[PDB]
Tab-separated table of C-alpha atoms in Angstrom:
chain	number	residue	atom	x	y	z
A	259	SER	CA	7.333	0.006	33.755
A	260	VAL	CA	8.159	-3.055	31.640
A	261	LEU	CA	9.462	-2.945	28.068
A	262	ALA	CA	9.525	-6.483	26.660
A	263	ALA	CA	11.116	-7.562	23.380
A	264	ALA	CA	9.714	-10.947	22.347
A	265	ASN	CA	10.493	-13.111	19.336
A	266	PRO	CA	7.389	-14.519	17.595
A	267	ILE	CA	7.449	-18.294	17.161
A	268	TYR	CA	8.286	-19.897	13.801
A	269	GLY	CA	10.982	-17.202	13.716
A	270	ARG	CA	9.158	-15.045	11.174
A	271	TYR	CA	5.758	-13.546	11.964
A	272	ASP	CA	3.516	-14.989	9.262
A	273	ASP	CA	0.958	-12.432	8.079
A	274	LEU	CA	-1.486	-15.216	7.141
A	275	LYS	CA	-2.144	-15.956	10.826
A	276	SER	CA	-3.802	-14.323	13.804
A	277	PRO	CA	-1.331	-12.971	16.400
A	278	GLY	CA	-2.465	-15.664	18.835
A	279	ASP	CA	-1.130	-18.383	16.520
A	280	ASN	CA	2.263	-16.680	16.067
A	281	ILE	CA	2.759	-16.595	19.855
A	282	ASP	CA	3.693	-19.187	22.487
A	283	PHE	CA	2.585	-17.953	25.906
A	284	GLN	CA	-0.554	-17.286	27.921
A	285	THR	CA	-3.157	-15.445	25.854
A	286	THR	CA	-4.031	-13.124	28.761
A	287	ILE	CA	-0.562	-11.578	28.395
A	288	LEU	CA	-1.878	-9.857	25.263
A	289	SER	CA	-4.419	-8.247	27.611
A	290	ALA	CA	-1.595	-7.006	29.873
A	291	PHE	CA	0.531	-4.875	27.538
A	292	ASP	CA	-0.869	-1.517	26.481
A	293	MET	CA	0.642	-1.783	22.986
A	294	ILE	CA	2.392	-4.369	20.820
A	295	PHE	CA	4.551	-3.613	17.768
A	296	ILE	CA	4.857	-6.358	15.152
A	297	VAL	CA	7.612	-4.750	13.094
A	298	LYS	CA	8.191	-6.137	9.604
A	299	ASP	CA	11.328	-6.092	7.457
A	300	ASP	CA	9.931	-6.808	3.998
A	301	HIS	CA	12.655	-6.390	1.391
A	302	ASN	CA	12.650	-3.106	-0.525
A	303	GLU	CA	15.022	-1.413	-2.952
A	304	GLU	CA	15.311	2.262	-2.024
A	305	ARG	CA	14.664	1.946	1.720
A	306	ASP	CA	17.443	-0.631	2.062
A	307	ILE	CA	19.785	1.640	0.088
A	308	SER	CA	19.054	4.542	2.438
A	309	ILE	CA	19.590	2.309	5.481
A	310	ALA	CA	22.876	1.060	4.010
A	311	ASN	CA	23.949	4.655	3.430
A	312	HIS	CA	23.225	5.449	7.080
A	313	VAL	CA	25.158	2.403	8.313
A	314	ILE	CA	28.174	3.189	6.120
A	315	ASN	CA	28.081	6.778	7.386
A	316	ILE	CA	28.049	5.432	10.953
A	317	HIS	CA	30.978	3.066	10.397
A	318	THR	CA	32.876	5.864	8.636
A	319	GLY	CA	32.828	7.960	11.816
A	320	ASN	CA	30.981	10.810	10.101
A	321	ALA	CA	28.016	10.130	12.395
A	322	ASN	CA	29.945	11.573	15.349
A	323	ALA	CA	30.451	14.940	13.645
A	324	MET	CA	26.888	14.912	12.297
A	325	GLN	CA	25.470	14.313	15.781
A	326	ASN	CA	27.717	16.997	17.275
A	327	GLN	CA	26.548	19.508	14.665
A	328	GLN	CA	22.910	18.519	15.218
A	329	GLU	CA	23.343	19.013	18.971
A	330	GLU	CA	24.887	22.426	18.291
A	331	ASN	CA	21.888	23.227	16.065
A	332	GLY	CA	19.505	22.190	18.844
A	333	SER	CA	17.999	19.406	16.726
A	334	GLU	CA	19.424	16.628	18.931
A	335	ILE	CA	19.658	16.339	22.720
A	336	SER	CA	22.645	14.922	24.578
A	337	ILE	CA	21.940	11.654	26.371
A	338	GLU	CA	22.969	13.068	29.760
A	339	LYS	CA	20.933	16.225	29.155
A	340	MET	CA	18.044	14.064	27.946
A	341	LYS	CA	18.181	12.016	31.156
A	342	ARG	CA	18.269	15.200	33.239
A	343	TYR	CA	15.252	16.527	31.328
A	344	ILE	CA	13.373	13.252	31.838
A	345	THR	CA	14.073	13.290	35.577
A	346	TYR	CA	12.952	16.922	35.808
A	347	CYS	CA	9.738	16.148	33.911
A	348	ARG	CA	9.006	13.132	36.117
A	349	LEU	CA	9.629	14.992	39.370
A	350	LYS	CA	7.710	18.194	38.643
A	351	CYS	CA	4.542	17.961	36.548
A	352	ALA	CA	1.488	15.696	36.646
A	353	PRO	CA	-1.094	16.619	33.998
A	354	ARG	CA	-4.758	15.664	33.754
A	355	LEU	CA	-7.069	15.215	30.777
A	356	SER	CA	-9.419	17.827	29.263
A	357	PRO	CA	-13.050	17.277	28.169
A	358	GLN	CA	-12.176	17.927	24.513
A	359	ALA	CA	-9.663	15.065	24.459
A	360	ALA	CA	-12.006	12.637	26.233
A	361	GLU	CA	-14.919	13.044	23.807
A	362	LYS	CA	-12.827	12.301	20.703
A	363	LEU	CA	-11.315	9.281	22.452
A	364	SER	CA	-14.806	8.024	23.288
A	365	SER	CA	-16.064	8.524	19.726
A	366	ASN	CA	-13.049	6.863	18.097
A	367	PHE	CA	-13.147	3.928	20.512
A	368	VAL	CA	-16.883	3.551	19.860
A	369	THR	CA	-16.172	3.348	16.125
A	370	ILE	CA	-13.388	0.802	16.697
A	371	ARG	CA	-15.617	-1.302	18.960
A	372	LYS	CA	-18.474	-1.231	16.446
A	373	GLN	CA	-16.111	-2.256	13.642
A	374	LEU	CA	-14.781	-5.209	15.665
A	375	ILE	CA	-9.796	-4.909	21.876
A	376	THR	CA	-11.753	-4.169	25.057
A	377	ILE	CA	-12.801	-1.125	27.069
A	378	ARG	CA	-9.395	-1.432	28.762
A	379	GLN	CA	-7.762	-0.184	25.549
A	380	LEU	CA	-9.494	3.209	25.685
A	381	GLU	CA	-8.279	3.779	29.245
A	382	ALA	CA	-4.796	2.573	28.269
A	383	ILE	CA	-4.655	5.132	25.442
A	384	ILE	CA	-5.099	7.837	28.105
A	385	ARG	CA	-1.624	6.922	29.364
A	386	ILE	CA	-0.086	7.967	26.036
A	387	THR	CA	-1.602	11.461	26.061
A	388	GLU	CA	-0.770	11.880	29.753
A	389	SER	CA	2.823	10.937	28.909
A	390	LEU	CA	2.913	13.454	26.058
A	391	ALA	CA	1.541	16.192	28.328
A	392	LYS	CA	4.234	15.295	30.871
A	393	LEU	CA	6.803	15.639	28.084
A	394	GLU	CA	5.496	19.114	27.252
A	395	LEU	CA	4.933	19.896	30.971
A	396	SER	CA	1.502	21.145	29.936
A	397	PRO	CA	-0.964	21.564	32.826
A	398	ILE	CA	-3.503	19.375	30.986
A	399	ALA	CA	-3.513	16.684	28.329
A	400	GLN	CA	-4.534	17.864	24.876
A	401	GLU	CA	-6.315	16.531	21.799
A	402	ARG	CA	-3.260	17.362	19.688
A	403	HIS	CA	-1.518	14.716	21.786
A	404	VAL	CA	-4.516	12.425	21.285
A	405	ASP	CA	-4.056	12.537	17.510
A	406	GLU	CA	-0.540	11.090	17.688
A	407	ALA	CA	-1.587	8.695	20.456
A	408	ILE	CA	-4.367	7.363	18.212
A	409	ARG	CA	-1.976	7.105	15.271
A	410	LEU	CA	0.471	5.067	17.363
A	411	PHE	CA	-2.338	2.899	18.735
A	412	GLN	CA	-3.565	2.202	15.197
A	413	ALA	CA	-0.035	1.467	13.962
A	414	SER	CA	0.630	-0.808	16.927
A	415	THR	CA	-2.463	-2.834	17.831
A	416	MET	CA	-3.848	-3.168	14.284
A	417	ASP	CA	-0.634	-4.685	12.882
A	418	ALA	CA	-2.524	-7.935	12.193
A	419	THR	CA	-21.158	5.548	6.999
A	420	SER	CA	-18.003	4.732	5.039
A	421	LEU	CA	-18.214	1.156	6.345
A	422	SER	CA	-21.245	0.638	4.098
A	423	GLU	CA	-19.153	1.720	1.102
A	424	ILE	CA	-16.328	-0.580	2.231
A	425	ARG	CA	-18.680	-3.560	2.459
A	426	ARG	CA	-20.202	-2.688	-0.921
A	427	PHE	CA	-16.661	-2.763	-2.315
A	428	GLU	CA	-16.209	-6.171	-0.677
A	429	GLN	CA	-19.380	-7.439	-2.368
A	430	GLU	CA	-18.351	-5.970	-5.730
A	431	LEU	CA	-14.924	-7.607	-5.437
A	432	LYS	CA	-16.514	-10.935	-4.502
A	433	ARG	CA	-18.537	-10.644	-7.712
A	434	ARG	CA	-15.521	-9.387	-9.684
A	435	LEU	CA	-12.970	-11.914	-8.388
A	436	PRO	CA	-14.004	-15.589	-8.364
A	437	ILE	CA	-12.414	-17.866	-5.789
A	438	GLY	CA	-8.904	-18.884	-6.818
A	439	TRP	CA	-8.310	-16.026	-9.261
A	440	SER	CA	-5.480	-13.496	-9.065
A	441	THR	CA	-5.150	-9.773	-9.727
A	442	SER	CA	-3.017	-6.760	-8.773
A	443	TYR	CA	-3.526	-3.635	-6.688
A	444	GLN	CA	-2.947	-1.339	-9.674
A	445	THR	CA	-5.464	-3.315	-11.741
A	446	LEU	CA	-8.096	-2.811	-9.038
A	447	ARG	CA	-7.151	0.878	-8.889
A	448	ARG	CA	-7.621	1.300	-12.643
A	449	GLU	CA	-10.829	-0.729	-12.877
A	450	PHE	CA	-12.683	0.505	-9.771
A	451	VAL	CA	-11.133	3.758	-8.491
A	452	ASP	CA	-10.161	5.411	-11.780
A	453	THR	CA	-13.702	4.518	-12.885
A	454	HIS	CA	-14.922	6.071	-9.596
A	455	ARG	CA	-16.892	2.980	-8.601
A	456	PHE	CA	-15.307	3.313	-5.143
A	457	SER	CA	-12.841	5.559	-3.338
A	458	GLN	CA	-9.179	4.739	-2.733
A	459	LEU	CA	-9.697	4.775	1.041
A	460	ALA	CA	-12.554	2.316	0.538
A	461	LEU	CA	-10.195	0.227	-1.609
A	462	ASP	CA	-7.539	0.075	1.113
A	463	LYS	CA	-9.997	-0.575	3.946
A	464	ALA	CA	-11.862	-3.281	2.017
A	465	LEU	CA	-8.622	-5.034	1.065
A	466	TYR	CA	-7.483	-4.889	4.703
A	467	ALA	CA	-10.767	-6.274	6.062
A	468	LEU	CA	-10.995	-8.991	3.398
A	469	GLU	CA	-7.431	-10.060	4.192
A	470	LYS	CA	-8.379	-10.363	7.859
A	471	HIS	CA	-11.621	-12.123	6.889
A	472	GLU	CA	-9.555	-14.765	5.019
A	473	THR	CA	-11.281	-13.825	1.759
A	474	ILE	CA	-8.135	-12.549	0.003
A	475	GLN	CA	-4.363	-12.599	0.444
A	476	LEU	CA	-1.945	-9.807	-0.438
A	477	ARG	CA	1.285	-10.965	-2.068
A	478	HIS	CA	4.541	-9.351	-3.213
A	479	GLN	CA	3.768	-5.982	-1.591
A	480	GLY	CA	0.499	-5.569	-3.491
A	481	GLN	CA	1.761	-6.615	-6.929
A	482	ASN	CA	-0.354	-9.782	-6.620
A	483	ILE	CA	-3.755	-10.251	-4.977
A	484	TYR	CA	-5.257	-13.727	-4.566
A	485	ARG	CA	-8.708	-14.631	-3.239
A	486	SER	CA	-8.078	-17.330	-0.636
A	487	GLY	CA	-11.741	-17.937	0.167
A	488	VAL	CA	-15.322	-16.724	0.115
B	247	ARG	CA	2.732	7.205	-34.936
B	248	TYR	CA	0.218	4.559	-36.016
B	249	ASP	CA	1.006	3.544	-39.601
B	250	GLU	CA	4.617	2.578	-38.882
B	251	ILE	CA	3.571	0.477	-35.880
B	252	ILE	CA	1.016	-1.544	-37.843
B	253	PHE	CA	3.471	-1.931	-40.735
B	254	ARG	CA	6.092	-3.272	-38.313
B	255	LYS	CA	3.583	-5.637	-36.695
B	256	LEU	CA	2.414	-6.823	-40.129
B	257	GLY	CA	5.994	-7.486	-41.255
B	258	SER	CA	5.541	-5.310	-44.339
B	259	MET	CA	8.408	-4.307	-46.616
B	260	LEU	CA	6.851	-0.835	-46.927
B	261	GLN	CA	8.236	0.105	-43.506
B	262	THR	CA	11.630	1.778	-43.712
B	263	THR	CA	14.700	0.104	-42.222
B	264	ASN	CA	16.670	2.005	-39.570
B	265	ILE	CA	20.150	1.322	-40.961
B	266	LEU	CA	20.623	4.826	-42.358
B	267	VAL	CA	19.946	7.993	-40.389
B	268	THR	CA	16.332	9.129	-40.535
B	269	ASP	CA	15.375	12.009	-42.805
B	270	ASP	CA	14.191	14.183	-39.907
B	271	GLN	CA	17.323	13.647	-37.802
B	272	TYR	CA	19.713	14.393	-40.663
B	273	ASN	CA	17.605	17.396	-41.690
B	274	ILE	CA	17.787	18.803	-38.156
B	275	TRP	CA	21.546	18.175	-38.042
B	276	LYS	CA	22.035	19.894	-41.413
B	277	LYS	CA	19.892	22.876	-40.416
B	278	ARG	CA	21.643	23.304	-37.064
B	279	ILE	CA	25.105	23.133	-38.656
B	280	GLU	CA	24.096	25.403	-41.549
B	281	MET	CA	22.454	28.016	-39.310
B	282	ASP	CA	25.857	28.767	-37.740
B	283	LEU	CA	27.841	28.057	-40.925
B	284	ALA	CA	27.423	31.580	-42.331
C	264	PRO	CA	7.367	-15.657	-36.037
C	265	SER	CA	6.464	-15.849	-32.383
C	266	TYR	CA	3.027	-17.126	-33.410
C	267	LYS	CA	1.822	-17.639	-29.826
C	268	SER	CA	3.287	-14.406	-28.452
C	269	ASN	CA	1.896	-12.318	-31.318
C	270	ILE	CA	-1.649	-13.525	-30.641
C	271	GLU	CA	-1.259	-12.981	-26.899
C	272	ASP	CA	0.040	-9.448	-27.480
C	273	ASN	CA	-2.786	-8.635	-29.894
C	274	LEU	CA	-5.259	-9.851	-27.274
C	275	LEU	CA	-3.570	-7.751	-24.576
C	276	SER	CA	-2.301	-4.821	-26.691
C	277	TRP	CA	-5.159	-4.351	-29.160
C	278	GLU	CA	-4.211	-0.669	-29.470
C	279	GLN	CA	-1.286	-1.864	-31.618
C	280	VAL	CA	-3.754	-3.255	-34.190
C	281	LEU	CA	-6.935	-1.186	-34.098
C	282	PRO	CA	-6.739	2.543	-35.020
C	283	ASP	CA	-19.816	5.879	-30.246
C	284	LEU	CA	-19.245	2.867	-27.997
C	285	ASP	CA	-16.330	1.864	-30.246
C	286	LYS	CA	-14.220	4.618	-28.658
C	287	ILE	CA	-14.551	3.177	-25.125
C	288	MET	CA	-14.944	-0.616	-25.143
C	289	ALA	CA	-12.283	-2.942	-26.528
C	290	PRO	CA	-13.274	-6.060	-28.495
C	291	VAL	CA	-14.890	-8.680	-26.270
C	292	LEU	CA	-12.273	-11.332	-27.063
C	293	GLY	CA	-9.344	-9.371	-25.627
C	294	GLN	CA	-11.245	-8.186	-22.560
C	295	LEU	CA	-12.232	-11.799	-21.892
C	296	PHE	CA	-8.621	-12.884	-22.406
C	297	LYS	CA	-7.735	-10.441	-19.631
C	298	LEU	CA	-9.897	-12.435	-17.210
C	299	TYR	CA	-8.560	-15.665	-18.729
C	300	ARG	CA	-5.062	-14.563	-17.737
C	301	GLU	CA	-6.490	-13.663	-14.325
C	302	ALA	CA	-8.319	-17.012	-14.259
C	303	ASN	CA	-7.348	-20.192	-12.418
C	304	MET	CA	-6.599	-23.577	-13.995
C	305	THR	CA	-10.185	-24.808	-13.544
C	306	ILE	CA	-13.121	-22.412	-13.694
C	307	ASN	CA	-16.741	-22.564	-12.616
C	308	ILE	CA	-18.152	-21.005	-15.781
C	309	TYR	CA	-21.000	-19.283	-13.923
C	310	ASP	CA	-18.498	-17.246	-11.892
C	311	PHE	CA	-16.611	-16.363	-15.081
C	312	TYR	CA	-19.847	-15.147	-16.682
C	313	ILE	CA	-20.637	-13.128	-13.548
C	314	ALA	CA	-17.233	-11.428	-13.638
C	315	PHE	CA	-17.502	-10.704	-17.368
C	316	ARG	CA	-20.958	-9.215	-16.794
C	317	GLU	CA	-19.594	-7.057	-13.973
C	318	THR	CA	-16.823	-5.696	-16.208
C	319	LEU	CA	-19.296	-4.549	-18.877
């Protein structure tokens, strides 16, 4: 098993670009990994304060006592005990999928394919639920593993009749926002969602699709929205 | 309040000036002190 | 006075001036000034009319 940490070119992964343009290597490599994680570090007030608090706690030496107490509480596993558990899980159990898990995977992958990733991705997702079943030593893989597997797949690969409503929102925004104009996420909320012209999920999905379709650009964490094209 | 806002926006001398304590605030202070005074 | 700022605020904050369609829709001038603030430096007037129509 290979875990590869790669630095995107230009140093910072530009969100205006397809992942192929922020990468310098053979394109087929993207077809080799099961998942990619384009993690972002956009500046934020409270999250940075919490992270700073954690780092100061670590440098203070309080983290040692906190981890010891958490291990005593059973909320944290010792690294040696964790390794022993991993070896035991690897050596003993070998689960297999269930029909209930397969059908939801097929339906969700059909929806993803229709929206657009190859058939290889659906079979790769099976590895995640098999791994989770191995973790639980369950005799079979389960749909409750498939939920988290799908969430991770969505939050990893997609880093860069409701579809009819989404596209109607896109059309209504193309009428509402001329090319070159600017607006804000809260303004769109107040004018379209608070007026119940469209749902909030439709708002988010339409903004996401339009950003990928080069129609609009999101700026300053949603405080500014600019239509970059048709 | 609506009248005070439009008076302030209009720059009218009818609007009171907040240099002295307001009537309501001083009345509440007087009532709260007097209620425990006797 | 802040002559410019006062007019801009009245356009944007008409509730500070004004006290059954009258209860819902603001005066057209301020609602159009909203788009004007949202507008770019140069405007194709047909698109501006379309947006104003859509807001009504």
